[PDB]
Each structure stands twice: as C-alpha cells, then as structure tokens.
PDB file of C-alpha atoms and ligand atoms in Angstrom:
ATOM      1  CA  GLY A   2     -24.589 -23.733  46.075  1.00  0.00           C
ATOM      2  CA  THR A   3     -25.928 -20.468  47.067  1.00  0.00           C
ATOM      3  CA  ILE A   4     -29.525 -19.610  46.666  1.00  0.00           C
ATOM      4  CA  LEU A   5     -30.908 -16.360  47.925  1.00  0.00           C
ATOM      5  CA  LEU A   6     -34.603 -15.668  49.362  1.00  0.00           C
ATOM      6  CA  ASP A   7     -36.396 -12.737  48.152  1.00  0.00           C
ATOM      7  CA  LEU A   8     -37.972 -11.870  51.255  1.00  0.00           C
ATOM      8  CA  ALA A   9     -40.827  -9.350  50.473  1.00  0.00           C
ATOM      9  CA  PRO A  10     -41.249  -5.469  51.686  1.00  0.00           C
ATOM     10  CA  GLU A  11     -44.596  -6.338  53.810  1.00  0.00           C
ATOM     11  CA  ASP A  12     -42.773  -9.501  55.416  1.00  0.00           C
ATOM     12  CA  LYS A  13     -41.877  -8.279  58.842  1.00  0.00           C
ATOM     13  CA  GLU A  14     -38.379  -9.609  58.902  1.00  0.00           C
ATOM     14  CA  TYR A  15     -37.390  -7.395  55.641  1.00  0.00           C
ATOM     15  CA  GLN A  16     -38.534  -4.479  57.654  1.00  0.00           C
ATOM     16  CA  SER A  17     -36.864  -5.615  60.975  1.00  0.00           C
ATOM     17  CA  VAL A  18     -33.427  -5.399  58.625  1.00  0.00           C
ATOM     18  CA  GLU A  19     -34.093  -2.284  57.206  1.00  0.00           C
ATOM     19  CA  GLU A  20     -34.898  -0.520  60.550  1.00  0.00           C
ATOM     20  CA  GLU A  21     -31.555  -1.622  61.627  1.00  0.00           C
ATOM     21  CA  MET A  22     -29.977  -0.408  58.869  1.00  0.00           C
ATOM     22  CA  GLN A  23     -31.827   2.703  58.506  1.00  0.00           C
ATOM     23  CA  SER A  24     -31.857   3.980  62.338  1.00  0.00           C
ATOM     24  CA  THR A  25     -28.247   2.882  62.636  1.00  0.00           C
ATOM     25  CA  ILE A  26     -26.683   5.558  60.343  1.00  0.00           C
ATOM     26  CA  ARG A  27     -24.449   8.126  61.887  1.00  0.00           C
ATOM     27  CA  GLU A  28     -21.965  10.552  61.052  1.00  0.00           C
ATOM     28  CA  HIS A  29     -18.194   9.723  60.712  1.00  0.00           C
ATOM     29  CA  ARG A  30     -15.167  11.396  61.023  1.00  0.00           C
ATOM     30  CA  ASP A  31     -14.205  11.675  58.161  1.00  0.00           C
ATOM     31  CA  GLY A  32     -17.868  13.688  57.099  1.00  0.00           C
ATOM     32  CA  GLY A  33     -19.104  11.545  54.154  1.00  0.00           C
ATOM     33  CA  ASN A  34     -15.791  11.474  52.576  1.00  0.00           C
ATOM     34  CA  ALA A  35     -15.419   7.692  52.156  1.00  0.00           C
ATOM     35  CA  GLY A  36     -19.705   6.677  52.466  1.00  0.00           C
ATOM     36  CA  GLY A  37     -20.715   9.747  50.856  1.00  0.00           C
ATOM     37  CA  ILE A  38     -23.060  12.305  52.261  1.00  0.00           C
ATOM     38  CA  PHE A  39     -26.887  11.436  53.332  1.00  0.00           C
ATOM     39  CA  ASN A  40     -29.485  10.649  56.338  1.00  0.00           C
ATOM     40  CA  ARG A  41     -31.146   7.590  54.673  1.00  0.00           C
ATOM     41  CA  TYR A  42     -30.971   4.510  52.414  1.00  0.00           C
ATOM     42  CA  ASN A  43     -33.179   3.732  49.551  1.00  0.00           C
ATOM     43  CA  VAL A  44     -33.313   0.170  50.174  1.00  0.00           C
ATOM     44  CA  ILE A  45     -33.721  -1.807  46.675  1.00  0.00           C
ATOM     45  CA  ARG A  46     -34.080  -5.653  47.829  1.00  0.00           C
ATOM     46  CA  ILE A  47     -33.303  -7.490  51.065  1.00  0.00           C
ATOM     47  CA  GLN A  48     -32.718 -11.230  50.292  1.00  0.00           C
ATOM     48  CA  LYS A  49     -32.002 -14.660  53.033  1.00  0.00           C
ATOM     49  CA  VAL A  50     -28.583 -15.920  51.577  1.00  0.00           C
ATOM     50  CA  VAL A  51     -28.988 -19.884  51.900  1.00  0.00           C
ATOM     51  CA  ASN A  52     -26.155 -21.804  51.693  1.00  0.00           C
ATOM     52  CA  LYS A  53     -25.697 -25.513  52.968  1.00  0.00           C
ATOM     53  CA  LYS A  54     -21.493 -26.067  53.181  1.00  0.00           C
ATOM     54  CA  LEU A  55     -21.143 -22.440  55.089  1.00  0.00           C
ATOM     55  CA  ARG A  56     -24.525 -23.212  57.463  1.00  0.00           C
ATOM     56  CA  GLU A  57     -22.546 -26.304  58.217  1.00  0.00           C
ATOM     57  CA  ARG A  58     -19.344 -24.926  59.075  1.00  0.00           C
ATOM     58  CA  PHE A  59     -20.828 -22.068  60.851  1.00  0.00           C
ATOM     59  CA  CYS A  60     -22.468 -24.444  63.081  1.00  0.00           C
ATOM     60  CA  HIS A  61     -19.713 -26.601  63.734  1.00  0.00           C
ATOM     61  CA  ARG A  62     -17.611 -23.915  64.694  1.00  0.00           C
ATOM     62  CA  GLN A  63     -20.356 -22.852  66.769  1.00  0.00           C
ATOM     63  CA  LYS A  64     -19.804 -25.942  69.246  1.00  0.00           C
ATOM     64  CA  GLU A  65     -16.281 -25.287  69.675  1.00  0.00           C
ATOM     65  CA  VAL A  66     -16.389 -21.965  70.820  1.00  0.00           C
ATOM     66  CA  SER A  67     -19.700 -22.592  73.072  1.00  0.00           C
ATOM     67  CA  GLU A  68     -17.290 -25.472  74.563  1.00  0.00           C
ATOM     68  CA  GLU A  69     -14.861 -22.740  75.698  1.00  0.00           C
ATOM     69  CA  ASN A  70     -17.153 -20.228  76.579  1.00  0.00           C
ATOM     70  CA  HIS A  71     -19.863 -21.589  79.281  1.00  0.00           C
ATOM     71  CA  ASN A  72     -21.581 -23.192  76.275  1.00  0.00           C
ATOM     72  CA  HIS A  73     -22.556 -19.893  75.351  1.00  0.00           C
ATOM     73  CA  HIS A  74     -22.413 -18.615  71.377  1.00  0.00           C
ATOM     74  CA  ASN A  75     -22.474 -15.389  71.766  1.00  0.00           C
ATOM     75  CA  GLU A  76     -23.540 -14.504  68.577  1.00  0.00           C
ATOM     76  CA  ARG A  77     -24.996 -11.111  67.342  1.00  0.00           C
ATOM     77  CA  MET A  78     -26.211  -9.310  63.902  1.00  0.00           C
ATOM     78  CA  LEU A  79     -23.611  -7.272  62.617  1.00  0.00           C
ATOM     79  CA  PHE A  80     -23.144  -4.982  59.599  1.00  0.00           C
ATOM     80  CA  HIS A  81     -20.270  -5.882  57.147  1.00  0.00           C
ATOM     81  CA  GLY A  82     -19.455  -4.346  53.848  1.00  0.00           C
ATOM     82  CA  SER A  83     -17.179  -5.145  51.017  1.00  0.00           C
ATOM     83  CA  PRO A  84     -16.098  -4.687  47.674  1.00  0.00           C
ATOM     84  CA  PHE A  85     -15.807  -8.805  47.927  1.00  0.00           C
ATOM     85  CA  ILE A  86     -19.963  -8.975  49.005  1.00  0.00           C
ATOM     86  CA  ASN A  87     -20.395 -11.457  45.967  1.00  0.00           C
ATOM     87  CA  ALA A  88     -17.580 -14.067  46.968  1.00  0.00           C
ATOM     88  CA  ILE A  89     -18.772 -13.959  50.713  1.00  0.00           C
ATOM     89  CA  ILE A  90     -22.312 -14.750  50.283  1.00  0.00           C
ATOM     90  CA  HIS A  91     -21.010 -17.757  47.300  1.00  0.00           C
ATOM     91  CA  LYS A  92     -17.993 -18.886  49.754  1.00  0.00           C
ATOM     92  CA  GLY A  93     -18.440 -17.253  53.327  1.00  0.00           C
ATOM     93  CA  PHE A  94     -15.825 -14.936  54.756  1.00  0.00           C
ATOM     94  CA  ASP A  95     -12.555 -15.805  54.634  1.00  0.00           C
ATOM     95  CA  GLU A  96      -9.509 -14.279  56.890  1.00  0.00           C
ATOM     96  CA  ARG A  97      -6.794 -15.463  54.278  1.00  0.00           C
ATOM     97  CA  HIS A  98      -7.981 -12.206  52.834  1.00  0.00           C
ATOM     98  CA  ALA A  99      -7.672 -10.073  56.146  1.00  0.00           C
ATOM     99  CA  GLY A 103      -6.139  -3.823  59.955  1.00  0.00           C
ATOM    100  CA  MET A 104      -6.330  -1.570  62.741  1.00  0.00           C
ATOM    101  CA  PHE A 105      -7.192  -4.694  65.103  1.00  0.00           C
ATOM    102  CA  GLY A 106      -5.035  -6.991  62.756  1.00  0.00           C
ATOM    103  CA  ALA A 107      -5.482  -9.797  60.448  1.00  0.00           C
ATOM    104  CA  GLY A 108      -9.258 -10.246  60.702  1.00  0.00           C
ATOM    105  CA  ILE A 109     -12.720  -9.578  59.238  1.00  0.00           C
ATOM    106  CA  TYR A 110     -14.371  -6.748  60.335  1.00  0.00           C
ATOM    107  CA  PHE A 111     -17.958  -6.200  61.647  1.00  0.00           C
ATOM    108  CA  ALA A 112     -20.153  -2.999  63.104  1.00  0.00           C
ATOM    109  CA  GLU A 113     -23.435  -2.154  64.545  1.00  0.00           C
ATOM    110  CA  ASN A 114     -23.731   0.665  62.567  1.00  0.00           C
ATOM    111  CA  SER A 115     -24.634  -0.225  58.997  1.00  0.00           C
ATOM    112  CA  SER A 116     -23.441   3.183  57.858  1.00  0.00           C
ATOM    113  CA  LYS A 117     -20.016   2.437  59.129  1.00  0.00           C
ATOM    114  CA  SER A 118     -19.746  -0.687  56.993  1.00  0.00           C
ATOM    115  CA  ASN A 119     -21.199   1.488  53.867  1.00  0.00           C
ATOM    116  CA  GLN A 120     -18.041   3.184  53.884  1.00  0.00           C
ATOM    117  CA  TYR A 121     -16.247   0.072  52.746  1.00  0.00           C
ATOM    118  CA  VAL A 122     -18.628  -1.217  50.365  1.00  0.00           C
ATOM    119  CA  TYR A 123     -15.778   0.866  47.640  1.00  0.00           C
ATOM    120  CA  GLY A 124     -13.125  -0.048  49.837  1.00  0.00           C
ATOM    121  CA  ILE A 125     -10.844   1.358  52.361  1.00  0.00           C
ATOM    122  CA  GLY A 126     -11.478   4.684  52.850  1.00  0.00           C
ATOM    123  CA  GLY A 127     -14.453   4.097  49.942  1.00  0.00           C
ATOM    124  CA  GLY A 128     -11.626   3.888  47.218  1.00  0.00           C
ATOM    125  CA  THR A 129     -12.781   5.708  44.112  1.00  0.00           C
ATOM    126  CA  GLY A 130     -16.647   5.117  44.507  1.00  0.00           C
ATOM    127  CA  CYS A 131     -19.026   3.693  42.014  1.00  0.00           C
ATOM    128  CA  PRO A 132     -17.222   2.432  38.839  1.00  0.00           C
ATOM    129  CA  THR A 133     -19.699   4.150  36.809  1.00  0.00           C
ATOM    130  CA  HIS A 134     -19.569   7.600  38.037  1.00  0.00           C
ATOM    131  CA  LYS A 135     -16.419   7.628  40.475  1.00  0.00           C
ATOM    132  CA  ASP A 136     -18.429   8.945  42.780  1.00  0.00           C
ATOM    133  CA  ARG A 137     -18.130   7.883  46.623  1.00  0.00           C
ATOM    134  CA  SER A 138     -21.121  10.078  47.179  1.00  0.00           C
ATOM    135  CA  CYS A 139     -23.104   8.522  43.944  1.00  0.00           C
ATOM    136  CA  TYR A 140     -27.089   8.579  44.631  1.00  0.00           C
ATOM    137  CA  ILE A 141     -27.391   6.525  41.241  1.00  0.00           C
ATOM    138  CA  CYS A 142     -25.614   3.448  41.517  1.00  0.00           C
ATOM    139  CA  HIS A 143     -26.553   0.022  43.731  1.00  0.00           C
ATOM    140  CA  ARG A 144     -24.835  -0.874  46.580  1.00  0.00           C
ATOM    141  CA  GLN A 145     -24.825  -3.837  48.887  1.00  0.00           C
ATOM    142  CA  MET A 146     -23.664  -4.885  52.182  1.00  0.00           C
ATOM    143  CA  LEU A 147     -24.389  -7.916  55.180  1.00  0.00           C
ATOM    144  CA  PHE A 148     -26.079  -8.474  58.064  1.00  0.00           C
ATOM    145  CA  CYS A 149     -24.661 -11.183  59.594  1.00  0.00           C
ATOM    146  CA  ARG A 150     -24.718 -13.958  62.313  1.00  0.00           C
ATOM    147  CA  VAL A 151     -21.324 -13.298  64.175  1.00  0.00           C
ATOM    148  CA  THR A 152     -20.289 -16.072  66.362  1.00  0.00           C
ATOM    149  CA  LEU A 153     -18.029 -13.290  68.934  1.00  0.00           C
ATOM    150  CA  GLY A 154     -17.538 -16.242  71.335  1.00  0.00           C
ATOM    151  CA  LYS A 155     -15.538 -15.331  74.787  1.00  0.00           C
ATOM    152  CA  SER A 156     -14.707 -11.879  73.081  1.00  0.00           C
ATOM    153  CA  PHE A 157     -11.442  -9.875  73.836  1.00  0.00           C
ATOM    154  CA  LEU A 158     -11.420  -5.993  74.415  1.00  0.00           C
ATOM    155  CA  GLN A 159      -8.059  -4.169  72.935  1.00  0.00           C
ATOM    156  CA  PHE A 160      -8.301  -0.216  73.825  1.00  0.00           C
ATOM    157  CA  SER A 161      -4.843   0.209  71.485  1.00  0.00           C
ATOM    158  CA  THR A 162      -4.266  -0.421  67.792  1.00  0.00           C
ATOM    159  CA  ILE A 163      -2.411  -3.721  67.847  1.00  0.00           C
ATOM    160  CA  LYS A 164      -1.661  -6.361  65.239  1.00  0.00           C
ATOM    161  CA  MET A 165      -2.970  -9.660  66.005  1.00  0.00           C
ATOM    162  CA  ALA A 166      -3.381 -12.767  63.559  1.00  0.00           C
ATOM    163  CA  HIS A 167      -6.051 -14.767  66.244  1.00  0.00           C
ATOM    164  CA  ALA A 168      -7.598 -13.649  69.145  1.00  0.00           C
ATOM    165  CA  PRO A 169      -5.985 -14.163  72.731  1.00  0.00           C
ATOM    166  CA  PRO A 170      -5.877 -17.398  73.919  1.00  0.00           C
ATOM    167  CA  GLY A 171      -9.068 -18.571  75.584  1.00  0.00           C
ATOM    168  CA  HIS A 172     -10.784 -16.569  73.402  1.00  0.00           C
ATOM    169  CA  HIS A 173     -13.099 -16.145  69.787  1.00  0.00           C
ATOM    170  CA  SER A 174     -13.113 -12.854  68.976  1.00  0.00           C
ATOM    171  CA  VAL A 175     -11.448  -8.670  69.249  1.00  0.00           C
ATOM    172  CA  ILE A 176     -13.980  -6.062  70.329  1.00  0.00           C
ATOM    173  CA  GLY A 177     -11.777  -3.221  69.300  1.00  0.00           C
ATOM    174  CA  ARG A 178     -12.026   0.562  70.286  1.00  0.00           C
ATOM    175  CA  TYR A 186     -16.381   3.237  68.439  1.00  0.00           C
ATOM    176  CA  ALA A 187     -16.233  -0.670  68.613  1.00  0.00           C
ATOM    177  CA  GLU A 188     -14.795  -2.594  66.066  1.00  0.00           C
ATOM    178  CA  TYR A 189     -15.945  -6.384  65.999  1.00  0.00           C
ATOM    179  CA  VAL A 190     -13.782  -8.544  64.739  1.00  0.00           C
ATOM    180  CA  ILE A 191     -12.844 -12.385  64.442  1.00  0.00           C
ATOM    181  CA  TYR A 192      -9.874 -14.459  62.939  1.00  0.00           C
ATOM    182  CA  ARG A 193     -12.166 -17.491  61.180  1.00  0.00           C
ATOM    183  CA  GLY A 194     -14.490 -17.130  58.834  1.00  0.00           C
ATOM    184  CA  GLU A 195     -16.585 -19.565  59.958  1.00  0.00           C
ATOM    185  CA  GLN A 196     -17.607 -17.229  63.091  1.00  0.00           C
ATOM    186  CA  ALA A 197     -19.767 -15.083  60.465  1.00  0.00           C
ATOM    187  CA  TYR A 198     -22.360 -16.583  58.597  1.00  0.00           C
ATOM    188  CA  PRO A 199     -23.949 -14.179  56.067  1.00  0.00           C
ATOM    189  CA  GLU A 200     -27.508 -13.838  56.580  1.00  0.00           C
ATOM    190  CA  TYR A 201     -29.281 -10.896  54.805  1.00  0.00           C
ATOM    191  CA  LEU A 202     -27.659  -9.622  51.405  1.00  0.00           C
ATOM    192  CA  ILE A 203     -28.689  -5.820  51.297  1.00  0.00           C
ATOM    193  CA  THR A 204     -29.365  -3.996  47.884  1.00  0.00           C
ATOM    194  CA  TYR A 205     -29.690  -0.109  48.318  1.00  0.00           C
ATOM    195  CA  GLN A 206     -28.938   3.474  47.443  1.00  0.00           C
ATOM    196  CA  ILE A 207     -27.643   6.151  49.564  1.00  0.00           C
ATOM    197  CA  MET A 208     -30.176   8.620  49.282  1.00  0.00           C
ATOM    198  CA  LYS A 209     -29.268  12.161  48.701  1.00  0.00           C
ATOM    199  CA  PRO A 210     -30.329  14.728  51.756  1.00  0.00           C
TER     200      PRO A 210
HETATM  201  O1  LIG B   1     -14.066 -12.417  54.271  1.00  0.00           O
HETATM  202  C1  LIG B   1     -13.062 -11.585  53.395  1.00  0.00           C
HETATM  203  C2  LIG B   1     -13.022 -11.883  52.020  1.00  0.00           C
HETATM  204  C3  LIG B   1     -14.076 -13.046  51.671  1.00  0.00           C
HETATM  205  C4  LIG B   1     -13.917 -13.464  50.206  1.00  0.00           C
HETATM  206  C5  LIG B   1     -13.097 -12.892  49.268  1.00  0.00           C
HETATM  207  F1  LIG B   1     -13.108 -13.486  48.321  1.00  0.00           F
HETATM  208  C6  LIG B   1     -12.214 -11.866  49.603  1.00  0.00           C
HETATM  209  C7  LIG B   1     -12.135 -11.081  51.212  1.00  0.00           C
HETATM  210  C8  LIG B   1     -12.316 -10.501  53.870  1.00  0.00           C
HETATM  211  C9  LIG B   1     -11.648 -10.216  54.956  1.00  0.00           C
HETATM  212  C10 LIG B   1     -10.991  -9.041  55.886  1.00  0.00           C
HETATM  213  N1  LIG B   1     -11.925  -7.720  55.430  1.00  0.00           N
HETATM  214  C11 LIG B   1     -11.724  -6.923  56.346  1.00  0.00           C
HETATM  215  C12 LIG B   1     -12.867  -5.921  56.004  1.00  0.00           C
HETATM  216  O2  LIG B   1     -14.116  -6.416  56.977  1.00  0.00           O
HETATM  217  N2  LIG B   1     -12.503  -4.660  56.072  1.00  0.00           N
HETATM  218  C13 LIG B   1     -13.733  -3.719  55.438  1.00  0.00           C
HETATM  219  C14 LIG B   1     -14.743  -3.331  56.747  1.00  0.00           C
HETATM  220  N3  LIG B   1     -13.818  -2.581  57.818  1.00  0.00           N
HETATM  221  C15 LIG B   1     -14.688  -2.078  58.888  1.00  0.00           C
HETATM  222  C16 LIG B   1     -16.254  -2.408  58.887  1.00  0.00           C
HETATM  223  C17 LIG B   1     -16.796  -3.153  58.077  1.00  0.00           C
HETATM  224  O3  LIG B   1     -18.154  -3.357  57.436  1.00  0.00           O
HETATM  225  N4  LIG B   1     -15.853  -3.576  56.466  1.00  0.00           N
HETATM  226  C18 LIG B   1     -17.180  -2.346  60.426  1.00  0.00           C
HETATM  227  O4  LIG B   1     -16.152  -2.063  61.240  1.00  0.00           O
HETATM  228  C19 LIG B   1     -15.227  -1.092  60.938  1.00  0.00           C
HETATM  229  C20 LIG B   1     -14.152  -1.721  60.201  1.00  0.00           C
HETATM  230  C21 LIG B   1     -11.211  -4.124  55.215  1.00  0.00           C
HETATM  231  C22 LIG B   1     -10.820  -4.203  53.853  1.00  0.00           C
HETATM  232  C23 LIG B   1     -10.141  -4.842  53.118  1.00  0.00           C
HETATM  233  C24 LIG B   1     -10.343  -4.624  51.411  1.00  0.00           C
HETATM  234  C25 LIG B   1     -11.648  -4.080  51.528  1.00  0.00           C
HETATM  235  S1  LIG B   1     -12.381  -4.020  52.657  1.00  0.00           S
HETATM  236  C26 LIG B   1     -12.548  -8.251  54.721  1.00  0.00           C
HETATM  237  C27 LIG B   1     -13.790  -9.138  54.233  1.00  0.00           C
HETATM  238 ZN1  LIG B   2     -22.256   5.911  40.522  1.00  0.00          ZN
END
C-alpha cells in the first residue's frame, strides 16, 4: 500500500518544497474568500508518498505519452489541492471523479491557488470544526505532484472537454490551469500538511 516518508525540516528536499509552497502564494480574484487570508503557511510536516502500484501506472503511462511526443515526458511539479487528498495518496488521481476546462484533474504552479480547494470548490464551508475558510487553527493539506503534461493543448476560452485533443496529453487552460484527463499522468509525490498564518 502507501507508505509516507517523513522528510526532515533540515532536508534539502523538505526545504525545496516549502520554498515552492511559500514563494507561490498570491492574491486571488475572490479576495481570499475561498482559501482564507494569509501571506505565509506554517508548514507542519512534509511527507514523500510511496506507492508501488501508482508508480507503475505512472511509469507505464509515461512511456506512451513519450512515444507520442518526440520521446519526452514533459513532466512538471505542480500543486494540487482537494478534499480528496487522502484517497489520492492511497489510490492515485481518478478522472472518474473529474470544471472550467472539462472533466479533468487540475493543478497549478501557485500553492495558494490549490489552497482554495482543500475544503472544496470556492472553499466550501471552511474547516469542519470552525466552519471557517480562513481558519488559522485547523491543519490543511495539499499535494506537490509529478505531472506528465506530454504534448499540451492550449485552450483560451472555457471548454467542456472529456479528453485532451488528439495527439495531445494535457490541456493548459487560460492564470493557466494544468489539466490532464488521465490519473496515470500524475503521481502525488509530496503530501504537505500546513496552516495558513494570520497576517
Ligand atoms: O482525482 C480526483 C479524485 C481522486 C480520488 C477520489 F476518491 C476522489 C477524487 C479528483 C479529480 C477531479 N479533480 C478536479 C480538481 O482538481 N478540483 C480542484 C482544483 N482545481 C484547481 C486547482 C486545484 O489544485 N484543485 C489548481 O488550479 C485551479 C483549478 C475541483 C474539485 C472538485 C471537487 C472538489 S475540488 C479533483 C480531484
Ligand atoms: Zn478550523
């Protein structure tokens, strides 16, 4: 099954991920409505996710994508946030649960943007305990994942697509939203447990 590797705060790895999480905070059109109001996370712990089977599907899909894209993975580390993280680290991303660019699995370069989703679309009703979307008490989680974009399609309006266009493997949707339509194309590498910190 899935085991979690407990990175150390003094790990050059750990540090690299918190810096990506910390440096990609930004302001959002909703004025902090969904994700709450903060300038910085209090990173409780960072964990590397290890799953035999998920690595295998990810590796296998990696080859097909490659053959169809001048033999390049075109992989990327992107943040994903969801109320579904527990199932994702245990069974991987599932497009059968899959928006502005169709029935896909969404990622983004800004940790803050994924933060909006940890309690659901538009932040839902905030933490279960304090019903607070800006809650500074409750621990949140997100994922820094390896994503196989393959040959990306670029959409510029909103479109309801089920799969990437032929010859493509992902959709970059315009801030850009990274969308794949196959779970295998993302592995959930880093489980991040954190708090938003009152400014
Ligand atoms: O893989 C999935 C899964 C796996 C296992 C399981 F048990 C249940 C689902 C699903 C597949 C559909 N996914 C769509 C999705 O990612 N949603 C949230 C979301 N949207 C965006 C970003 C982000 O970080 N998270 C970042 O960019 C902006 C869009 C949109 C959302 C829909 C519902 C809640 S958030 C959400 C996860
Ligand atoms: Zn709370």
